[PDB]
């Protein structure tokens, strides 16, 4: 009666489900066939839960990672990205690899998503959250700081650093993704 499930328990349950689905009379009748689908949907639900374990954990941790970041001279930064083939969920991966510049960088996530909202294509636009060193930021006064197409300040970064290996999310219309590293991205 502990709530957390071990891998072996999860495996035993999956097996029970496979076996029940594989051997039941679910193709013998209209009634039975419908029950067969219900089962497949039950097994499906369950695989969606366990499949999601790791992303859920990373989500529950991201608050912690944030509070640590503030008090160790780090911050999460947001980089706007553009592709010519924005529908190809694979042509994005090759662009993220060439980050280590001219793209717009925002301190507030609300601002970069606002800017994306204005874009026409909306399929050719994405962005990555990135953990930064916060000593890496060249702090311009508000009198000097570049601004976007809304009157919102952008961040500028000091030279030849910030090739940071800690992305932590990739936002797109398709959905929120994750750098595998691996050089591919996916999440659900």
């Amino acid at each position: 009666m502990k709530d957390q499930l071990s891998d072996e328990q999860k495996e035993t349950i999956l097996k029970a489900l496979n076996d029940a689905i594989e051997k039941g009379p679910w193709d013998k009748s209209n009634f039975l066939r419908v029950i067969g689908k219900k089962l497949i949907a039950i097994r499906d639900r369950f695989l969606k839960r366990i499949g999601a374990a790791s992303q859920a954990q990373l989500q529950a941790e991201s608050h912690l990672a944030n509070q640590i970041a503030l008090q160790s001279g780090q911050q999460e930064i947001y980089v706007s990205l553009y592709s010519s083939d924005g529908s190809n969920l694979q042509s994005w991966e090759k662009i993220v690899g060439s980050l280590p510049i001219s793209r717009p960088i925002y301190a507030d996530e609300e601002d970069i998503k606002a800017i994306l909202k204005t874009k026409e294509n909306k399929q050719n636009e994405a962005y990555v959250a990135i953990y930064i060193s916060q000593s890496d930021i060249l702090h311009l006064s508000a009198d000097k700081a570049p601004v976007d197409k809304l009157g919102k300040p952008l961040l500028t970064l000091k030279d030849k650093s910030i090739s940071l290996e800690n992305i932590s999310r990739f936002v797109h219309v398709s959905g929120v993704y994750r750098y595998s590293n691996g050089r591919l991205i996916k999440n659900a």
């Binding site: 502990k2 709530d3 957390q4 489900l17 029940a20 029950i35 839960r49």
Partner: protein, 59 residues
């Protein structure tokens, strides 16, 4: 959105629907007792649940 499976989600999203299902197949059985297919289905559902419940309570 989605979190891991727990003992609670196992009971809520596998064991309970499957019990409801057993109830329903039992009705379809009371129309023609001895209909093999339906009776078989009750046996498979019932096995499924005892295996999953065993697994959930870590027996």
């Amino acid at each position: 959105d989605v979190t891991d499976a727990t003992l609670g989600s196992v009971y809520s999203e596998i064991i309970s629907p499957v019990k409801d299902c057993i109830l329903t197949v039992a009705k379809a059985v009371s129309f023609n007792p001895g209909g093999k297919d339906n009776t078989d289905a009750v046996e498979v559902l019932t096995e499924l649940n005892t295996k999953v419940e065993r697994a959930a309570l870590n027996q």
